[PDB]
């Protein structure tokens, strides 16, 4: 049960959403950036914690943050 | 915000270029943009980029 | 696994779909002799209960181990036999 | 959009593997991915090996959501093929999951509400000492 | 079909790219921003297939680089020959092989280095060498420094020729891709010419030069009085005096009266009693037979002339009911990817090098080599280490092929796909084998230790206690010892003296070879070897098979061959790449080879090597303590490492002091590697941040931003310094001990 | 020839030349002034 | 050694019976659902 | 050339596993189906009795031929006691496993579907009462097998090649 937060420094380049291997993130209409869109994390129950989204974020410091927490059979990535 | 071609100092505390000088590239004049100033630097950060967006109150006139 | 065609997914047969089969399970009821079953159900049936089995196992193991340890003959265990040679002096004459 | 249902569509031509389903699928969820192909092609199974996809509808059982999404990403970026996948529970419940509103997540779509968005920079979060003996985490504020 | 196809002037010869450090890469060419650029530049230099996408340029670069390595090898050989011609006591050694220590390196007097110039004999001072070049030169028939100087000059000329050939075939006349893919013609030409003609030429040299000169040397003729090699060619009367069958000319050869040449083409086992080496007449008949066999084998594959086999059809024909499509599709893989060929060749070359080490100690081919214990130990250990490294590289580059050049479209139901489809069973059964071997061997050692400590030696797995005899190896030894009577009747003696049957060969009061008994300790140590080898194979095979995907990471092939991790998620995914599997296989290969060389050293010193006196009584170096003291870990620690390291730690103030210095330095480097192995990158990056602040405070910060070494670079540096330290420690220990007591 | 001069100014080549000259100087000094433990001046 | 037979009872007890009971109890305790 | 032996498990390519001569074979399948463990319709007590008898009988030899007292005059008794102690420890392990795995209300966990798709009654071994009965039977049978092996080896002479 990891937690993913998006901060208002996002520019809406959509790289984090493309990088997510489990479809946790998605783009949402917004006002506050030139692209006029921001990222959201509705399916945080499916997050595995790989932190590819953080690696894909261009910003001084990250606009998307992953805070590791309770481990579950989906978070542990178990096929058995 | 600062005019194009200005030299500004970053004051964002979590920024990689804190207390370092920049080079203003473009300022967005839309009313609702939260970080409209675009600043380009000389050295790349850990992620390898050299451009960032800052608020007008996170830059110094020098 | 409906099985009619290359279809292997079927919500009607979810045990076939998930592959929940019994590979070697055999359900023939006749294996042993009747009197064998009578004798074994009469005698071996006492240990069926599990809490009583735990208590009996623990008490019996403790009793057996203690009795064997405290009554073992010296000719079997060297620790009970004890030393049989004169002790050796230390380096600086320290015993 | 109205989420689609499931049916009895043929599976790809695969000869078997040891990377298939296990007891987890029996006593927990397992995933099914569906797509349509214009011609028979050879593709790499996410579980290892090569399979042939049929002409028309295809259906594939997989053990993890990551496997389904990796196969779908390869299908989209290499064969130009649209795909769906679901989640199946042991009792028969089916949950439609990937194109939740019919639009892929990297495209902005109306009717979506933000979740987890904080209206500040990452440097404005509070101190762990301020929220002492409280259940907050300083990023939930 | 098969023809010469080249391109004229493909690449212009200029120094412009020498001033562009990262020209070969499109990302490195832009110049550096951080210190990572330097490491990336020196790391991607010779990885040709990552720069371009067309096989033609890759093939041309590979051809020219192989020319360059050949030139380097020629320079090395010329250097060895010259340094033996000018800075050696080879002639004095020729006079008295059993008392003069070989020496070919001399140090200058500068800072006290004088002490390294030892008293090797022959009125000479220098470093004693263990490469065995003196024995090889004596077997070749060289009796003067002029011949060695001529060979050195020829080697330099050949190095220049190889350099010119590399320049020519890259910058002037580059072959096309269709030229490199003539695998049938390549196998025909190499297998016939390079092997058969080379063996025939060496057999000719042996017959016409080496046999008479070594015959005279073994007789007792002074080296200065022996006629020069051309005098046996211009005057056949001398060669007929030594071997009378030369007086018949080549008539018996063409009339098929080959039995006339039986006095210099013999089939006799054992060793020469005078020199303790193999008879050179057997070496003549065997390089000749090898030449004939290879020349016959090289006329097999189809080419422009119709006749011959076609490899594609052969591969497509052998398939059965258990394996689907069988060997179909392998021809395109092996004619399309350089990495698959590299993997196969590395595996075969490493295995061959290990076989060379075994066969060379068991049947010493050079005169006065068996009784030079330092040379035997050095050669065995060296070529064994080389073979281990090559077999690890095989797995590395096979995994590279699997990640990069694998194509699922071509491989549908052939052997590769079906291997990739039952990999879990393979890895599970191999895991069970590794655990079983480890338990039932190392637990036997620990059981022996515990019984010995408890004062119950009657409960041990020893020869006097409960026995574990190697009955199969004993039977094989007995069978091979009785061959010259039943199954190889034309042989005079057995293949080697190590088999149970035979006698003792002594040269100059030292044992050359001797029957090697096998007991409980040998059983234990070979089953240890089996354990370590199956474990190394497990690691490397798991790395190769799971290189593209697994259950944990379904898309591992997108991340590449060499990546650090995939984040702390899924519990943690550190070292999921095939590169890290090679990284661990290197450690386990080190473990295995170290145990192997320790077994060889102790067994030889304890049961074979020794001094023999009058009445034929043999005294061994360690007095036969291997059988009793090697069944315990404490036995190893006390009677091998503690006992035999007395020479290296007492070598200060003598000519062997460099060995002690390097012993200490190698322990140091091995310890130093642990700080790269045990730590992570973030700590060092933050420490570098503080140090960069310190340099910034004085306006002296560098323009290229300092960065901590990458994760993969940290692992590579750790493993490299670790291997160097361990191997150098063993090197110094072995050389000091065996030079002192040998 | 300009490209050759630029190549000869690279860090490894210059380091090799500089350290070779320094090592030669130290070796010659120790050849002519050996076993120097304390500075006489 | 006033007794000299007590170790022959206590050492086997603490060494075999005590670990068995405590490991069984702990295994039952951790393998619960409550 | 199209004949092939290896087949996906029960014809489903997407279930982990293969169906090989080792896995499926009339001799191997018959032998595995006629072992007491897979006799799902037989009472667990008698299956446990047979399994315990076999294991207790096989355990006697290793403890007697190899052991601290193997060269003494009480080797057989010591080995038999050691085998009985091992049987007791394994009975304790079975009891605690059954306690930790099964509750008194769960119907059963064994698969109720044959390979040919037939529906059959699930095995009663995978239940609290079934496991308890199987454990009691295993204990009694193991003790009986150890006693029988000891009697045959030493109470009666019965010469053996190694003994
Ligand atoms: C710290 C506690 C402890 C104690 C008291 C012992 C005591 C003993 N060990 Mg030992 N052992 C221990 C820990 C201990 N061990 C550990 C930690 C290990 C693992 C490394 C071993 C591994 C080990 C081996 C491998 C062997 C022993 C053996 C023995 C016996 C040899 C003496 C003799 O005359 O044998 C005579 C012994 C008999 C005649 C056996 C009769 C005793 C029966 C079986 C008691 C009944 C068991 C009881 C019901 C269990 C209750 C559990 C609740 C002796 C009873 C040897 C043995 O089995 O004997 C033997 O081969 N031990
Ligand atoms: C792998 C090749 C190789 C290696 C490692 C060496 C190594 C060495 N050579 Mg050598 N050499 C080589 C090839 C090689 N040589 C070749 C090919 C030639 C012929 C051109 C020579 C000709 C040569 C001479 C003429 C001398 C050396 C000397 C030396 C020693 C000191 C060199 C120095 O510091 O300057 C050193 C042990 C010097 C030496 O040993 O002085 C005692 C010395 O005088 N070398
Ligand atoms: C490439 C190999 C090679 C070469 C170039 C030569 C070259 C020569 N051999 Mg020779 N030879 C060789 C291999 C070779 N030999 C082998 C392998 C054998 C053993 C079967 C012989 C057996 C042999 C005999 C018996 C004689 C020669 C002779 C000769 C010379 C006249 C022809 C010539 C120098 C003749 C000669 O003049 O002897 C010096 C001669 O009588 N050779
Ligand atoms: C003739 C044998 C041979 C050949 C031609 C190659 C060739 C290659 N190896 Mg390989 N290798 C070999 C033997 C060989 N190897 C053996 C025996 C081992 C076992 C240790 C390895 C282990 C190995 C590793 C781990 C890697 C390579 C890599 C490479 C590639 C680039 C190497 C480089 O960049 O140098 C740079 C040289 C240095 C940095 C000097 C360090 C000393 C290149 C295709 C790399 C690669 O394939 O990247 C995709 C790579 O990561 N090799
Ligand atoms: C902290 C490390 C350290 C220090 C302080 C020294 C100090 C010294 N070493 Mg030592 N050494 C060291 C590490 C060190 N070493 C290590 C690690 C090794 C192994 C590689 C050696 C190996 C070594 C040798 C083999 C020798 C020394 C020598 C010397 C002496 C220098 C001779 C001299 O004055 O040259 C004069 C040079 C100058 C004055 C330089 C002048 C520079 C310019 C031109 C002046 C302006 C001096 C006492 C030599 C000696 O005489 O020892 C008593 C000697 O023979 N050392
Ligand atoms: C920390 C205290 C301590 C420790 C480490 C030991 C250690 C030992 N005792 Mg000992 N003992 C102690 C206190 C201790 N004693 C006290 C206070 C008494 C008086 C009742 C005894 C009476 C005693 C007897 C009568 C015997 C031993 C024996 C032994 C040895 C075998 C272990 C055994 O049978 O335990 C048996 C332990 C007891 C009967 C009582 C121990 C007291 C408690 C349990 C200590 C508390 C442990 C710890 C604080 C709890 C937390 C653990 C984490 C071993 C050397 C045996 C021997 O001599 O072997 C050669 C033996 O026969 N002990
Ligand atoms: C180290 C292992 C070991 C040792 C020492 C023995 C020793 C012995 N076994 Mg034995 N056995 C073993 C392993 C071993 N077995 C295994 C793994 C099996 C397979 C389950 C058997 C199955 C077996 C049978 C079926 C019988 C023996 C019997 C015997 C005894 C006479 C032969 C002898 C004491 C015989 C016996 O005790 O009859 C009285 C007998 O009938 N053994
Ligand atoms: C002995 C073994 C071989 C050693 C190397 C031999 C190199 C021979 C020439 C190779 C380049 C051939 C193509 C020329 C053309 C080329 O390279 O680029 C062409 C380029 C032309 O420059 P220019 O300024 O003359 O012309 C620019 C045009 O735009 C208008 O003219 O440079 C040259 O002509 C320089 C040629 C020599 C460059 C190397 C000089 C130094 C070489 C030797 C270094 C070591 C000296 C040691 C002395 C002890
Ligand atoms: C022993 C097994 C045996 O007979 O192997 C030999 C057997 C031969 O199968 P086929 O006759 O179908 O092979 C035909 C060609 O593929 C041979 O190149 O192959 C296998 O069983 C596959 C590997 C099993 C490996 C098991 C370990
Ligand atoms: C591939 C070939 C490489 C080597 C090329 C050069 C080969 C030179 C050796 C071939 C000559 C063989 O020499 C062999 O026959 C010669 C006659 O033919 C003999 O020569 C003998 O008879 C000659 C007349 O025919 C006299 O001039 C000689 O004085 C006399 O020695 C040699 O005593 C004998 O050794
Ligand atoms: C020590 C260590 C470092 C720190 C080491 C560094 C930064 C390497 C330094 C290499 C040398 C010393 C740099 C030399 C720079 C110039 C070449 C100097 C030129 C001037 C003269 C000295 C020639 C890591 O970065 C690291 C990363 C990942 C895992 C483990 C570790 C690790 O253990
Ligand atoms: S950590 Fe991985 S799974 Fe979680 S949101 Fe980021 S990319 Fe997606
Ligand atoms: S510890 Fe290092 S290697 Fe492991 S997941 Fe974290 S960053 Fe990757």
CSV table of C-alpha atoms and ligand atoms in Angstrom, one decimal, chain E residues 675-676 679-681 684 688 708-710 714, chain F residues 19, ligand 11:
chain,number,residue,atom,x,y,z
E,675,UNK,CA,35.1,-0.9,0.5
E,676,UNK,CA,33.7,-0.8,-3.0
E,679,UNK,CA,29.1,0.2,0.2
E,680,UNK,CA,26.6,2.2,-1.9
E,681,UNK,CA,26.8,5.3,-4.1
E,684,UNK,CA,30.0,8.8,-1.5
E,688,UNK,CA,31.7,14.5,-2.5
E,708,UNK,CA,30.5,9.2,-7.4
E,709,UNK,CA,31.1,6.1,-9.4
E,710,UNK,CA,28.0,4.5,-10.9
E,714,UNK,CA,31.3,0.3,-8.2
F,19,UNK,CA,55.1,11.5,-14.8
I,11,LIG,C1,35.2,4.7,-2.6
I,11,LIG,C2,34.0,4.6,-3.4
I,11,LIG,C3,33.6,5.7,-4.2
I,11,LIG,C4,34.5,6.9,-4.3
I,11,LIG,C5,35.6,6.8,-5.3
I,11,LIG,C6,35.8,7.6,-6.3
I,11,LIG,C7,35.1,8.9,-6.5
I,11,LIG,C8,36.8,7.2,-7.4
I,11,LIG,C9,38.0,8.1,-7.4
I,11,LIG,C10,39.0,7.7,-8.5
I,11,LIG,C11,40.3,8.5,-8.6
I,11,LIG,C12,41.0,8.6,-7.3
I,11,LIG,C13,40.1,9.8,-9.2
I,11,LIG,C14,41.3,10.5,-9.8
I,11,LIG,C15,41.0,11.8,-10.5
I,11,LIG,C16,42.1,12.3,-11.4
I,11,LIG,C17,42.5,11.3,-12.4
I,11,LIG,C18,43.4,12.8,-10.6
I,11,LIG,C19,44.4,13.4,-11.5
I,11,LIG,C20,45.6,14.0,-10.8
I,11,LIG,C21,46.7,13.1,-10.3
I,11,LIG,C22,46.4,12.3,-9.1
I,11,LIG,C23,47.1,12.2,-11.5
I,11,LIG,C24,32.4,5.6,-5.1
I,11,LIG,O1,32.1,6.5,-5.8
I,11,LIG,C25,31.6,4.4,-5.0
I,11,LIG,C26,30.4,4.3,-5.8
I,11,LIG,C27,29.7,3.1,-5.8
I,11,LIG,C28,30.0,2.1,-4.9
I,11,LIG,C29,31.1,2.2,-4.1
I,11,LIG,C30,31.9,3.3,-4.2
I,11,LIG,C31,33.1,3.4,-3.3
I,11,LIG,O2,33.4,2.5,-2.5
